[PDB]
Design a protein around this ligand. Structure first.
Ligand SMILES: OC[C@H]1O[C@H](O[C@H]2[C@H](O)[C@@H](O)[C@@H](O[C@H]3[C@H](O)[C@@H](O)[C@@H](O[C@H]4[C@H](O)[C@@H](O)[C@@H](O[C@H]5[C@H](O)[C@@H](O)[C@@H](O)O[C@@H]5CO)O[C@@H]4CO)O[C@@H]3CO)O[C@@H]2CO)[C@H](O)[C@@H](O)[C@@H]1O
Ligand SMILES: OC[C@H]1O[C@H](O[C@H]2[C@H](O)[C@@H](O)[C@@H](O[C@H]3[C@H](O)[C@@H](O)[C@@H](O[C@H]4[C@H](O)[C@@H](O)[C@@H](O[C@H]5[C@H](O)[C@@H](O)[C@@H](O)O[C@@H]5CO)O[C@@H]4CO)O[C@@H]3CO)O[C@@H]2CO)[C@H](O)[C@@H](O)[C@@H]1O
Ligand SMILES: OC[C@H]1O[C@H](O[C@H]2[C@H](O)[C@@H](O)[C@@H](O[C@H]3[C@H](O)[C@@H](O)[C@@H](O[C@H]4[C@H](O)[C@@H](O)[C@@H](O)O[C@@H]4CO)O[C@@H]3CO)O[C@@H]2CO)[C@H](O)[C@@H](O)[C@@H]1O
Ligand SMILES: OC[C@H]1O[C@H](O[C@H]2[C@H](O)[C@@H](O)[C@@H](O[C@H]3[C@H](O)[C@@H](O)[C@@H](O)O[C@@H]3CO)O[C@@H]2CO)[C@H](O)[C@@H](O)[C@@H]1O
Length: 1526
């Protein structure tokens, strides 16, 4: 059953995090395998990659990964495997990587540049954890309890070990970590290994004997077993080092050390003969150690000769100049700085006349001049004859060259001295650690830094032995030639053990890499896992290759690291690549009480009432995605990784931080006896145990041992003394955690609260699904620090239960035995007097501690939050699908959207939108409003948000959500949605205040997704199966199309009517504009499948016609206004678009409507007998337009004067349109008029612009005539098929033209009248004036308008003509124009309404301005540089069409040897839509704006969601879809 999760990639192929859980790693769920299935029967998991559509990374895209294809193909980390990415511009690709076996896995993408070179992404790793299991018992990785045992304090039979096993076993540890149990070195450290291939002889003969022992623990005590593995060193005494001295760092491999080796041999040479000189045998004073210090300087620094290791031997160089003088002739070049530049020159000699390896460390005297090249320089520079003070001048240069080399040697040797001051004064004088043993064979001053021996190959050698460095970047091998640590004495040295030089790979040390392979394999097949000692100082590549080896031998290997690299950032990288399962943490490192309350809070779990992830509005809802109809898919034995909802988007795969294994105390930790008090052994151990994480403990901690046990010098066995110290209490803690084990799986599940108060720590450990808590009061004994009274503890809507209490008390001191290691004497006495008090009216629990509660104590309560059971979880995640089942694309508006005024309109003034205290109102009353706010909130777990606050401050939002819908209750399927939301909301309100933010988020998020999946399902497939960006655009339809009370499109009914934009054009006499509806209709209604709707709109506006054209503003068709020339044509174009797209849509034409105005252009009878009086087929309405225009229109706007328009001058009101029969084109309007969409009628007083419009667009508007062309074309093509029945047009004289002629008329005259050619000579043919011009290569915005130059302005309107009727345009001419637009008119999200070069380019729309600026005052600007967004939609459609005809490299050989666009062109289209993708992600409303200000700046007056802004971008998608997608 279902075991997939979904890893969204970005545009750059980077993974996408679903939640901020902070610096993490992509680890997959630690579940067991589904019931029955063994490893390799099936994918363990499957990571779905989801690549976004049209992203750069999909251009010759490819996904490379090293997950093997099948269960048989071994993993090799280097072998990759290809997967082709399917490009769509609409449709995101998805690629499944099946994982068959656990480990670590990367993938990258290869793809093609915009240089057409081949680029790679980084690698992106992800981990699959082992299934730890003991019998038929799955051990989740948070129920590990690991007891570190040291092999050599368990006594000499495997029998006496089985007792130590029994004792841990009874405290219910399930994992034992052994420190290595191999043949030990000479020092007898378990970390100093004599032979990694053989197990300790004292105990085991064979490996069988150890594997069988470990297999006892498994069956005998239910215990899994780790080993320490040691990668960085073997022991001084190993006699494979005789046989392979190359494995370490010596004269041959690491030659830089040659200086450091000589220093070391000449320091144990000293302590020998130091006896015969000065008085430093044994000392106790800083001013008779300074006596040894100068004794050093003389006999060892001095005796290795001013350090020929750094510096040039000037005396040698010079006298070999005198002998080889006269040999490299001269130096011919000009490259020598004059002798005056003492420095510049010496730097020149360094570069040009030195032997390779200059400025190195290595050999005794290996920093050499090229004598002969030097001579040359000197000859050229000074004199050919040596005897003109060359000997001199050569020494000067040579010395200047040695100046940084000598300061290098001095910096180095001061740091040698100070390092030897501070480790003879630590090793031989008490500071923190006295150890005053004077000199020996085996106790000199200098720690042996190198191990010294004659090899089997006969030669002497000296391998560097390993250590650590106080404040060093740990990732930088200090034995490498990068660092001088062995020479500078910066190493803290385990003379015990020898450092192992792995290489770049096995080539550099091949014998080594084989032993370590033989070693790692051997342990891997015995043990369930490893503990990697000192991981951060083991080069990644080494760690990776050897863990891979093991994990080949044992797929379910468990790996635990001691790892502090520099950053969390790094520790993630190591975990990533090595497949580390667990990072180790130490409680004993906490200095104070607070330092511990903090550690505990890192490894606690998430806040109480933390937000829960849902997919919201940044996902694609495939119309065809699975549904889990009442959340019943997941079957408990199948171990299915579950989706959040009914709708089956998978569980996202996000970075979570690496898994922690918290040690109450490690085997390198000073004991609570030492660092605090034995009494703290309890509360410290409980605190840790109460974390949500694995835990462990060293043997003896629970047993209350006194001193940390020295790994080397210790001799004895562990006591057989059963049930000592804390045993009873771990048994309880471990058995308790086991009960919890089953339940909490994922990071979101176990929440918590931690509180430090003085010496008390308080740890609430909740489960977030079901409400079970555990509460712990731990009173620490950091010190014996007196009497403190913790205050009345208060829980909310919670119940409490005493579970246990204890106090650890010191009975006296530790016994003292030569051959047995024992505990401190300790009582563990049970406690009482804890007063639990539940207030039946607050529902508050108060907890009072008795005064008998000595530091060193615990009380555990079990808790249970009130209002949560197992039941809740499911009920919240179900039936949201069946609620929405009755929704329409109208009714979805009501549930989701509804701008505030849209909601005052339904509620006659009293309802509106919810004011969140200290935030303000959301934007839609409906769910979108909330989702827009919640999303960032869920992402950041912001429980501080004003919404988060108000949501527990009370339940008012909860109820607002369910009560809004009273208004829209009768609308289809809203009722049922509301009732889903009431039931879930009702139930939520039975929760503790503090859980209501979390659950309200989820309850909304769920119904929002259901609601949105329901939208894609009812819309067309082209929308249904596309990208987010597109659905997002598509939904904007559902914002705009809803029914009202104050308005409609039919006048007797109120139905679904399309608004121009929210919230400025949504209500009363202002929602519908003929212009806006019909520019939108294709995008929002047709592209999307809402054909039935489109029809209702077309027919509803049809009714309105008069003056042979269609009205601007439509009062649901009753007293509309005809100040609009634009409209009729945009209308007719939609009629075409409909007949084209709708199946059998031709039949629209025969559809009758009530004409609700008479056939002459008679005055307004609103509701006479003369309204529903006579009818009209859409057929004879199209005709009606063409014919009326043909024969001239002329009219004084019905009902003129201040009333119908407050600003229109008297002159303007009466309007004209007349067809110039010389060209066939429509001229009209006047200089006091705005028939076009660029219709600001200037209003300001102080700037003097009243009744004087800013963009009259009289005469031949470009769009209008392009639209006329389209219309003629279409009706002709229709005449041809019986559907239109007209060729008829009477002209204002009486004469009659074939519609077919009119078509042929424009077809020749249009481009002529409108084009402005690039070449000044072609002007003849194209009708113009040179001095009244701006640019060229334009198609002008107007022909013969009221003012000369307003024709010749570059403006984004011609693009409309180019889309609707491209036959008018000679390809190459248009492609040049549309390309200038792209560099000049195209803003980042909208199209500049005027050429920036122009004198009256003022690109900031400020509709408030009361100024004396004729341009800017009261928004005259609107259409003069402001960047409109529907304009981009025409621009981009057009830009694609003509780059696909015109340009060769925009095309390619498609399906069926016919042409389709190339990746190159899509790339350019995609790029010009990124700022729209982003705009819509980050609008608080779904959509794109009306209108932007100069270069993308947000225009505060712009309606922030416009209808046509997205309708026109939907068009483009539909083109690419219909045009090329089969
Ligand atoms: O110049 C370098 C160094 O030398 C001199 O300091 C000496 C110290 O004063 C001396 O005590 C000795 O350190 C002891 C130490 O007393 C003892 O506690 C234990 O060391 C602890 C460290 O105290 C502790 O910080 C921790 O170290 C971490 C380290 O912080 C972490 O970043 C990472 O690198 O891992 C380290 C541990 O692996 O744990 C260690 C024990 O593991 O043992 C030490 C050795 O006996 O060290 C110096 C003499 O050798 C200079 O005076 C001083 O400027 C510098 O500290
Ligand atoms: O009872 C019916 C109704 O009749 C009369 O209405 C008339 C208007 O009062 C009258 O001014 C005229 O309207 C024209 C207007 O002159 C013209 O400028 C244009 O309107 C533009 C705005 O100028 C423009 O700024 C923009 O306004 C947005 C603004 O960007 C936004 O920030 C926010 O403030 O909202 C505004 C929209 O509400 O866009 C509009 C329209 O696109 O076009 C108008 C008509 O074409 O003609 C009206 C005809 O009915 C009465 O005066 C009125 O009181 C009565 O209710
Ligand atoms: O051959 C006899 C040698 O005697 C001397 O060496 C001593 C050192 O001076 C001590 O410092 C000590 O080193 C221990 C170390 O104290 C202990 O913590 C442990 O460290 C592990 C550690 O647990 C692990 O996390 C990782 O860091 O690896 C370490 C293993 O190195 O073990 C250290 C080594 O035993 O003991 C040594 C050995 O007695 C003297 O300096 C030598 O020159 C001399 O040869
Ligand atoms: O001061 C306002 C100014 O506006 C009107 O002139 C217009 C020009 O006709 C128009 O072409 C444009 O001028 C550009 C030139 O044509 C072009 O050759 C090049 O030189 O750049 C000019 C930059 O504007 O500018 C204005 C419209 O904004 C009006 O007719 C003038 O009388 C009036 O003085």
């Amino acid at each position: 059953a279902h075991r997939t999760l979904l890893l969204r990639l970005s545009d750059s192929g980077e993974p996408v995090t679903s939640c901020s859980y902070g610096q993490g790693v992509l680890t997959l769920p630690s579940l067991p395998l589904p019931q029955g299935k063994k490893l390799g029967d099936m994918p363990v998991y499957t990571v779905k990659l989801a690549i976004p559509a049209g992203s750069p990374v999909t251009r010759d895209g490819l996904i490379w990964t090293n997950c093997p294809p099948d269960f048989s193909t071994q993993f090799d980390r280097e072998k990759f495997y290809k997967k082709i990415i399917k490009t769509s511009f609409h449709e995101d690709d998805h690629i499944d990587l099946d994982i068959y076996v656990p480990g670590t896995y990367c993938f990258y993408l290869s793809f093609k540049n915009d240089k057409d070179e081949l680029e790679t992404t980084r690698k992106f790793y992800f981990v699959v954890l082992p299934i730890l299991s003991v019998n038929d018992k799955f051990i989740p990785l948070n129920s590990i309890a690991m007891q570190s045992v040291v092999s050599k304090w368990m006594g000499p039979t495997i029998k006496d070990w089985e007792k130590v096993f029994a004792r841990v076993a009874s405290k219910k540890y399930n994992m034992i970590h052994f420190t290595p149990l191999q043949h030990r070195g000479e020092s007898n450290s378990p970390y100093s290994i004599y032979d990694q291939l053989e197990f300790d002889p004292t105990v085991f003969k064979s490996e069988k004997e150890v594997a069988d022992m470990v297999e006892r623990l498994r069956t005998e005590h239910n215990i899994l077993s780790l080993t320490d593995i040691v990668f960085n060193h073997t022991a001084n005494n190993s006699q494979w080092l005789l046989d392979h001295p190359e494995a370490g760092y010596n004269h041959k491999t690491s030659p830089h050390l040659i200086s450091a080796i000589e220093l070391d041999k000449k320091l144990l040479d000293f302590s020998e003969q130091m006896e015969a000189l000065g008085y430093p045998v044994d000392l106790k004073t800083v001013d008779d150690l300074i006596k040894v210090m100068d004794g050093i300087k003389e006999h060892v620094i001095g005796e290795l000769k001013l350090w020929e290791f750094y510096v040039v031997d000037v005396k040698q160089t010079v006298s070999e100049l005198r002998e080889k003088w006269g040999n490299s002739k001269s130096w011919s070049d000009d490259n020598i700085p004059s002798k005056d530049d003492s420095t510049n020159l010496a730097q020149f000699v360094r570069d040009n006349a030195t032997e390779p390896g200059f400025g190195s460390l290595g050999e005794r005297g290996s920093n050499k001049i090229n004598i002969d090249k030097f001579a040359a320089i000197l000859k050229k520079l000074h004199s050919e004859d040596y005897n003109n003070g060359i000997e001199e001048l050569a020494t000067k240069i040579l010395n200047d060259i040695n100046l940084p080399f000598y300061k290098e040697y001095d910096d180095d040797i001061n740091e040698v001295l100070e390092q030897l001051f501070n480790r003879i004064k630590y090793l031989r004088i008490d500071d923190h650690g006295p150890k005053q043993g004077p000199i020996t064979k085996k106790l000199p001053l200098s720690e042996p830094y190198f191990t010294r021996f004659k090899a089997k190959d006969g030669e002497e050698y000296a391998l560097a032995n390993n250590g650590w460095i106080w404040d060093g970047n740990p990732l930088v091998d200090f034995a490498s030639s990068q660092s001088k640590a062995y020479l500078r004495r910066e190493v803290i040295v385990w003379g015990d053990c020898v450092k192992l030089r792995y290489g770049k790979g096995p080539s550099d040390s091949p014998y080594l890499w084989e032993r370590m392979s033989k070693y790692v394999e051997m342990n891997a097949r015995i043990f369930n896992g490893f503990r990697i000692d000192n991981c951060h100082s083991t080069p990644l590549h080494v760690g990776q290759y050897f863990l891979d080896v093991a994990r080949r031998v044992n797929p379910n290997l468990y790996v635990v690291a001691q790892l502090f690299s520099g950053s969390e950032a790094m520790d993630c990288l190591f975990v990533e690549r090595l497949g580390i399962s667990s990072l180790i943490r130490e409680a004993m490192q906490a200095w104070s009480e607070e330092e511990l309350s903090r550690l505990v809070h890192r490894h606690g779990g998430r806040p109480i009432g933390s937000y829960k992830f849902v997919p919201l509005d940044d996902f694609p809802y495939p119309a065809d995605v699975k549904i889990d109809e009442e959340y019943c898919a997941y079957n408990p034995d199948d171990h299915s990784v579950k989706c959040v909802s009914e709708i089956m988007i998978p569980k996202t795969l996000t970075a979570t931080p690496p898994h922690a294994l918290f040690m109450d105390c490690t085997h390198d930790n000073e004991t609570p006896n030492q660092k605090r008090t034995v009494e703290d052994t309890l509360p410290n151990a409980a605190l840790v145990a109460f974390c949500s994480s694995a835990i462990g403990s060293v043997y003896g901690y629970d047993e209350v041992f006194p001193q940390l046990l020295d790994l080397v010098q210790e001799k004895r066995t562990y006591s057989c003394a059963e049930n000592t110290g804390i045993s009873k209490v771990k048994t309880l803690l471990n058995n308790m955690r086991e009960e919890i084990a089953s339940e909490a799986v994922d990071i979101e599940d176990s929440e918590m609260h931690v509180h430090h108060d003085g010496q008390y720590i308080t740890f609430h450990r909740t489960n977030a699904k079901n409400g079970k808590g555990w509460y712990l009061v731990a009173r620490t004994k950091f010190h014996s620090s007196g009497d403190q009274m913790l205050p009345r503890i208060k829980l909310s809507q919670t119940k409490a239960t005493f579970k246990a209490a204890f106090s650890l008390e010191r009975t006296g001191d530790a016994p003292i035995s030569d051959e047995i290691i024992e505990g401190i004497p300790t009582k563990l006495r049970e406690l009482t007097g804890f007063d639990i008090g539940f207030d039946e009216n607050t529902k508050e629990t108060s907890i009072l501690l008795p005064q008998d509660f000595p530091q060193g104590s615990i009380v555990i309560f079990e808790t249970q939050q009130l209002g949560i059971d197992d039941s809740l979880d499911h009920f919240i995640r179900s039936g949201a699908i069946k609620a929405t089942e009755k929704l329409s694309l109208e009714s979805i508006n009501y549930v989701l959207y509804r701008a505030e005024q849209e909601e005052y309109d339904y509620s006659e003034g009293r309802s509106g939108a919810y004011d969140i205290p200290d935030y303000g109102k959301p934007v839609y009353c409906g769910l979108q409003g909330w989702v827009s706010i919640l999303r960032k909130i869920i992402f950041y777990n912001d429980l501080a948000h004003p919404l988060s606050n108000n949501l527990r401050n009370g339940h008012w939002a909860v109820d607002y959500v369910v009560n809004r819908l009273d208004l829209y209750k009768d609308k289809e399927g809203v009722a049922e949605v509301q009732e889903w939301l009431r039931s879930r909301m009702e139930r939520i309100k039975q929760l503790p205040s503090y859980l209501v933010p979390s659950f309200f988020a989820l309850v909304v998020g769920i119904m929002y997704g259901c609601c949105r999946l329901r939208a894609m399902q009812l819309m067309s497939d082209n929308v249904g199966k596309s990208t987010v960006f597109v659905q997002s655009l598509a939904m904007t339809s559902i914002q705009m199309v809803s029914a009202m009370k104050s308005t409609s499109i039919l006048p007797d009914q109120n139905i679904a009517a399309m608004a121009a934009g929210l919230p400025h054009f949504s209500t009363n006499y202002m929602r519908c504009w003929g212009r806006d509806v019909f520019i939108s209709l294709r995008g929002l209604l047709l592209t999307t499948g809402r054909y039935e709707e489109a029809k209702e709109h077309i027919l509803a506006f049809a009714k309105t016609l008069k003056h042979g054209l269609i009205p601007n503003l439509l009062d649901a068709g009753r007293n509309p206004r005809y100040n609009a020339r634009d409209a009729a044509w945009f209308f007719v174009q939609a009629i075409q678009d409909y007949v084209t797209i709708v199946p059998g849509g031709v039949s629209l034409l025969q559809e009758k409507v009530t004409r609700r105005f008479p056939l002459d252009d008679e005055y307004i009878p609103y509701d006479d007998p003369k309204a529903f009086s006579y009818s009209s087929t859409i057929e004879e309405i199209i005709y009606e337009i063409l014919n009326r225009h043909a024969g001239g229109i002329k009219y004084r706007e019905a009902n003129a004067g201040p009333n119908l328009d407050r600003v229109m001058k008297d002159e303007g009101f009466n309007v004209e349109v007349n067809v110039d029969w010389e060209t066939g084109l429509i001229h009209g309007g006047s200089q006091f008029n705005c028939g076009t969409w660029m219709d600001k009628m200037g209003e300001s007083e102080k700037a003097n612009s009243v009744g004087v419009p800013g963009t009259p667009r009289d005469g031949a508007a470009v769009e209008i005539n392009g639209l006329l062309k389209s219309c003629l074309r279409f009706v002709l093509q229709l005449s041809k098929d019986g559907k239109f029945k007209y060729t008829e047009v009477t002209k204002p004289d009486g004469s009659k033209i074939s519609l077919s002629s009119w078509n042929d008329l424009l077809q020749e005259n249009f481009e002529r009248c409108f084009y402005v050619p690039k070449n000044k000579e072609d002007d003849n043919k194209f009708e113009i004036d040179a001095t009244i011009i701006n640019r060229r290569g334009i198609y002008k915005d107007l022909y013969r308008s009221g003012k000369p130059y307003e024709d010749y302005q570059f403006r984004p309107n011609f693009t409309i003509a180019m889309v609707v009727a491209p036959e008018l345009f000679t390809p190459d001419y248009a492609a040049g124009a549309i390309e200038l637009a792209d560099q000049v008119l195209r803003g980042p999200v909208g199209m500049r309404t005027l050429d920036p070069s122009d004198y009256n380019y003022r690109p900031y729309y400020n509709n408030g301005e009361d100024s004396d600026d004729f341009a800017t005052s009261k928004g005259r600007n609107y259409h003069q540089g402001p960047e409109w967004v529907w304009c981009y939609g025409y621009f981009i459609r057009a830009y694609h069409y003509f780059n696909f005809l015109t340009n060769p490299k925009c095309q390619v050989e498609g399906s069926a040897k016919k042409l389709k666009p190339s990746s190159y062109l899509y790339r350019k289209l995609y790029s010009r839509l990124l700022k729209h993708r982003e705009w819509i992600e980050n609008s608080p409303w779904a959509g794109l704006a009306e209108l932007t200000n100069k270069d993308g700046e947000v225009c505060n007056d712009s309606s922030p969601t416009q209808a046509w802004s997205t309708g026109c971008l939907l068009d483009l998608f539909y083109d690419l879809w219909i045009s090329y997608e089969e």
